[PDB]
Amino acid sequence: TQKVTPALIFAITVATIGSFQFGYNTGVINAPEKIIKEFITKTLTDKGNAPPSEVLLTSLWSLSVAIFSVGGMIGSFSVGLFVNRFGRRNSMLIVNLLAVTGGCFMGLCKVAKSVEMLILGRLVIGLFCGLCTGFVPMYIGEISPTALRGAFGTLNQLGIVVGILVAQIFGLEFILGSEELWPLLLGFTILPAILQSAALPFCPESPRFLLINRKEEENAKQILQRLWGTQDVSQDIQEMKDESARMSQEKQVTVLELFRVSSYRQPIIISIVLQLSQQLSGINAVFYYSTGIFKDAGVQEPIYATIGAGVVNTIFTVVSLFLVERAGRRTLHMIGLGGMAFCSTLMTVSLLLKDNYNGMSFVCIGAILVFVAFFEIGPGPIPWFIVAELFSQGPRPAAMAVAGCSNWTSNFLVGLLFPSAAHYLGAYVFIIFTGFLITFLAFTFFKVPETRGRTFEDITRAFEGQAHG
Numbered sequence: 001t002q003k004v005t006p007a008l009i010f011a012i013t014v015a016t017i018g019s020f021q022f023g024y025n026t027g028v029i030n031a032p033e034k035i036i037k038e039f040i041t042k043t044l045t046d047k048g049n050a051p052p053s054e055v056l057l058t059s060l061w062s063l064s065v066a067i068f069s070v071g072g073m074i075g076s077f078s079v080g081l082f083v084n085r086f087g088r089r090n091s092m093l094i095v096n097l098l099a100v101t102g103g104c105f106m107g108l109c110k111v112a113k114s115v116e117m118l119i120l121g122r123l124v125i126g127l128f129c130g131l132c133t134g135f136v137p138m139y140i141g142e143i144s145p146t147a148l149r150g151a152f153g154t155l156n157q158l159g160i161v162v163g164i165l166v167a168q169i170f171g172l173e174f175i176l177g178s179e180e181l182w183p184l185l186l187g188f189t190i191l192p193a194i195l196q197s198a199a200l201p202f203c204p205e206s207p208r209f210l211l212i213n214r215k216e217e218e219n220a221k222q223i224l225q226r227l228w229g230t231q232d233v234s235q236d237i238q239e240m241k242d243e244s245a246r247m248s249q250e251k252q253v254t255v256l257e258l259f260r261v262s263s264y265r266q267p268i269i270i271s272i273v274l275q276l277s278q279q280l281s282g283i284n285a286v287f288y289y290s291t292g293i294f295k296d297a298g299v300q301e302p303i304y305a306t307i308g309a310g311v312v313n314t315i316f317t318v319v320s321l322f323l324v325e326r327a328g329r330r331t332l333h334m335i336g337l338g339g340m341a342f343c344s345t346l347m348t349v350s351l352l353l354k355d356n357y358n359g360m361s362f363v364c365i366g367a368i369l370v371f372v373a374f375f376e377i378g379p380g381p382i383p384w385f386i387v388a389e390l391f392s393q394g395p396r397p398a399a400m401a402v403a404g405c406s407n408w409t410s411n412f413l414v415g416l417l418f419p420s421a422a423h424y425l426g427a428y429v430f431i432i433f434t435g436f437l438i439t440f441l442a443f444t445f446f447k448v449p450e451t452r453g454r455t456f457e458d459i460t461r462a463f464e465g466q467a468h469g
C-alpha cells in the first residue's frame, strides 16, 4: 500500500546532499597537497618569515587535513543538541551556515594569504560534515517506509561516494586542481549547501519527530499519507504511538545513560563496534595510499587507476542498495568484512612477492579494487544507517551522537597511526586491518541482529527481552 512518491524521493535526495558534502570534503583535500604546501610556503615568506622546513610544512599540512576530522568528532557528537531542539529538517537547514562559512574561509584563504583561514575553514567544514553524518541517516531512517529503510539508508553512502568521486574528478589538474583554481576546488562546497538550503524548507519534518517528540499526531499522519502515497498508515501511526508511550515512560536519555542501561548497552556496543568495523577496515588508508601503491606496482597512470577505484566505490554502493533488503544487513556486512579480509591479506602477500614474481604486481592492483568493492557491499553503507535502526525515538539522537563520534574518532586514529605503523611493518601493515576485519566478522555473526523489515519497536523489545536475561 506504501509507494515511493516523488515527494519521498525529493526529501531523501535533498537530505543526501549533506552526504555528498561529507564525501566531497573527505576526498577533495588529497589531490592538491603539493599546490597547498607551496601556498603555505609562499605565505610564510610573503609575510617576511623564513621558508618552512620540510617538517614544519608537513606539520601544517597534516594539521590542514586532520583538523577536518577533529571538527567532525565534535560535530557528530553534537547532533543531540540540534535535532530535538530544532527538529531534523530544521537542523539540516541551520547548519548550512557552517558549510557556507567554512567554504568561504577556504575559498578566500589564498587571496587573504592566510594559512589560519585554511585551517579554520577545514575545522568549520569538519563541524558541518560531522553534524551531517548524524543528521542525514537520522532523517532518512525516520521518514522511510519500514520495508525500504535499509535501501533508502544506503542512499546516504551513495551520496558520500559520489561526493568522493566528484572530488577526485575536480581535483584533476586540468579541472580545478591547479595552482590558480584550487581555492575554488575547496570553495565548491558552498554550492551544494546553497542548493540544499533552498530545497530544505519544502521537505517535511520527520513525522516520527512530529508525532512522538511533539505529540502532533494529525500532522504526522498527513505527512505520512503524502510521503508514502496512501491514506492507510494506521500500522505505522500506531507503532509511533507505541514509541511515544515508551518515551514518556523512560527518563530523558543521556550519552552516559546508554552505557549504564542494559537495554541500551547492547545496541550501543553493537553501534560503536560496527563503526569501528567500517573505519578499522583500513578503507581510508587503502584509498588514500592506493595511488602510491598502484604506482609502485607499475601502473603507468596511477591517478586514473585511483579514479577507477572511486568508480568501483560507487558502482558497488549501488549494488548494496539493491541487495540490502533482500540479503539483510548481517549477510552484506559479513560478506564485505570477509572479502576485505581476503583482499588486505592479498595486498600484503602481493607486495611482499612482487619484486621476485612480477605477475604479483597485477594481483596487488586487483586486490585494491576488489577490496573497495567488498567494502561498499556492506561495511560502507550499513554502519551509517543501522544505528538509527537499533534504537527507538527517545535514545536515537544520543546514540547516533556517540556512534557517529566513534566513527570519526577511529578515522582520526587510523590517519594518525597508520603512517608510523606502515613505516615499521611495511607490507605487513595491512594484516593489522585483516585482524580487525576478522575480529569484527566474528562479532557481526554472533552479536548483530537482523534489522531488515522490522519496526524500531520490535528491535527495541527484543533488546529488552535479552536484557531480561
Ligand SMILES: CCCCCCCC/C=C/CCCCCCCC(=O)OC[C@H](O)CO
Residues within 6 Å of the ligand: 026, 027, 028, 030, 031, 032, 033, 034, 065, 164, 168, 283, 284, 287, 288, 289, 290, 291, 306, 415
Ligand atoms: C605532483 C603530483 C601531485 C599528486 C599528489 C598525490 C595525490 C595524493 C593521493 C591521493 C589519493 C586519492 C584519494 C582521494 C579520494 C579518497 C579520499 C579518502 O578516502 O581519504 C581520506 C583522506 O585522504 C584522509 O587523509
Ligand SMILES: CCCCCCCC/C=C/CCCCCCCC(=O)OC[C@H](O)CO
Residues within 6 Å of the ligand: 012, 013, 016, 017, 020, 155, 156, 157, 158, 159, 160, 162, 191, 192, 193, 195
Ligand atoms: C562538470 C560538472 C558541472 C557541475 C559543477 C557545478 C555544480 C553545481 C551544483 C552544485 C551542487 C552540488 C550538486 C548536488 C549533489 C547532490 C548529491 C546527491 O544527490 O547524490 C546522490 C544521492 O545518493 C541520491 O539520493
Ligand SMILES: CCCCCCCC/C=C/CCCCCCCC(=O)OC[C@H](O)CO
Residues within 6 Å of the ligand: 338, 339, 341, 342, 345, 346, 349, 357, 358, 359, 360
Ligand atoms: C575468507 C577469506 C580470508 C582468507 C585469507 C587467506 C589468504 C589467501 C591468500 C592467498 C595468496 C596466495 C597467492 C600465491 C600465488 C602464487 C604466487 C606465485 O607463485 O607467482 C608466480 C607468478 O608467475 C607471478 O609472476
Ligand SMILES: CCCCCCCC/C=C/CCCCCCCC(=O)OC[C@H](O)CO
Residues within 6 Å of the ligand: 323, 327, 335, 339, 365, 366, 369, 370, 373, 374, 377
Ligand atoms: C547474495 C550475496 C551477493 C553479494 C555480492 C558480492 C559482490 C562483492 C564483490 C565482488 C567482486 C568480485 C569478487 C570475486 C573476485 C573476482 C576478482 C576479479 O575478477 O576482478 C578482476 C580484477 O579487477 C583484475 O584487475
Ligand SMILES: CCCCCCCC/C=C/CCCCCCCC(=O)OC[C@H](O)CO
Residues within 6 Å of the ligand: 423, 424, 425, 431, 432, 433, 434, 435, 436, 439
Ligand atoms: C582484537 C585483536 C585484533 C587486532 C588486530 C590483529 C593484530 C595482529 C597483527 C599483529 C602484527 C604483528 C606485530 C609484529 C611486531 C614487530 C614490529 C617490528 O619489530 O618491526 C621492526 C621493523 O622491521 C623495523 O624496520
Ligand SMILES: CCCCCCCC/C=C\CCCCCCCC(=O)OC[C@H](O)CO
Residues within 6 Å of the ligand: 327, 328, 330, 331, 334, 335, 336, 337, 338, 339, 342, 445, 450
Ligand atoms: C574471497 C572470498 C571471500 C568472500 C566471502 C567472505 C566470507 C564470509 C561471507 C559470507 C558469510 C556470511 C554470509 C552467509 C551467512 C549469513 C546468514 C546469517 O548469518 O544471517 C541470518 C540472519 O537471520 C539474516 O536474515
Ligand SMILES: C=CCCCCCCCCCO[C@@H]1[C@@H](O)[C@@H](O)O[C@H](CO)[C@H]1O
Residues within 6 Å of the ligand: 026, 065, 066, 068, 069, 157, 160, 161, 164, 278, 283, 284, 313, 380, 411, 412, 413, 414, 415, 416
Ligand atoms: C588524522 C588524519 C585523518 C583525517 C581523515 C580525514 C577524512 C576523514 C573522513 C573519513 C570518511 O570515511 C568514509 C566512510 O565513513 C564511508 O562513508 O566510506 C567512505 C569511502 O567510500 C569513507 O571515505
